[PDB]
């Protein structure tokens, strides 16, 4: 199934555990921990649903909220795992080569390991130093330098 939405059969309050709270561009939170699970409590301690949550997921309703059921409680990309930004502001791109590590689709690829992955931290405002950014194979960043991106935001990574 291509749908990444999670449905809830019965009105049980979500009990999220073993998760990492990271502030995103909105009121929702993004989990950076690979191992996550969901538990539902409605009137007793017995659980009803478990499911699973991958890294970089965005929850629709906050933890401990009595969801009425039948509505999505967490949303994530079924094809890509986003990487959040620990520092909010402009992104510093190091060793950007045009014609070899740039692929027009602005949305441009970062670098290719076979063709050659510089690591740099996100700038505070314009170019201040404040975090290691890893660029695997076929990794593409659609935001340019000076974009002033906020924390918890990620573009398409384009997994190989």
């Amino acid at each position: 199934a291509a749908e990444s939405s999670i449905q809830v059969k019965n009105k049980g309050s979500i009990k999220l555990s073993n998760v990492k709270s990271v502030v995103n561009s909105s009121g929702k939170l993004v989990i950076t921990s690979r191992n996550t699970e969901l538990k539902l409590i409605d009137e007793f301690g017995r659980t009803k649903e478990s499911y699973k949550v991958p890294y970089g997921a965005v929850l629709a309703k906050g933890d401990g909220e009595q969801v009425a059921g039948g509505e999505t409680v967490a949303n994530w990309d079924p094809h890509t795992m986003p990487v959040i930004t620990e520092v909010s502001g402009f992104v510093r791109f190091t060793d950007m080569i045009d014609g070899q590590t740039i692929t027009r689709q602005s949305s441009l690829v970062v670098l290719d390991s076979a063709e050659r992955r510089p690591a740099l931290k996100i700038v505070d405002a314009q170019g201040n130093d404040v975090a290691q950014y890893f660029l695997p194979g076929k990794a593409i960043v659609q935001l340019e330098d000076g974009v002033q991106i906020s924390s918890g935001d990620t573009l398409a990574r384009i997994p190989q």
Binding site: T32, S33, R34, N35, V83, Q132, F134, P136
Partner: protein, 49 residues
């Protein structure tokens, strides 16, 4: 891990799940895929297998 680094080699044909450190504990899934009962007993314990 404080002392005695663990030496492991990945044939690069399989992706790495945890890019950063994140304080990976023993028994964590470094690479996705089915796991053998042999590895479960050695690390996760006799009860887990």
């Amino acid at each position: 891990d404080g002392s005695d680094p663990y030496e492991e080699m990945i044939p690069k044909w399989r992706q790495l799940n945890v890019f950063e450190g994140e304080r990976v504990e023993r028994g964590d899934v470094i690479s996705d895929g089915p796991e053998a009962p042999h590895d479960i007993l050695r690390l996760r314990g006799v009860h887990a297998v």
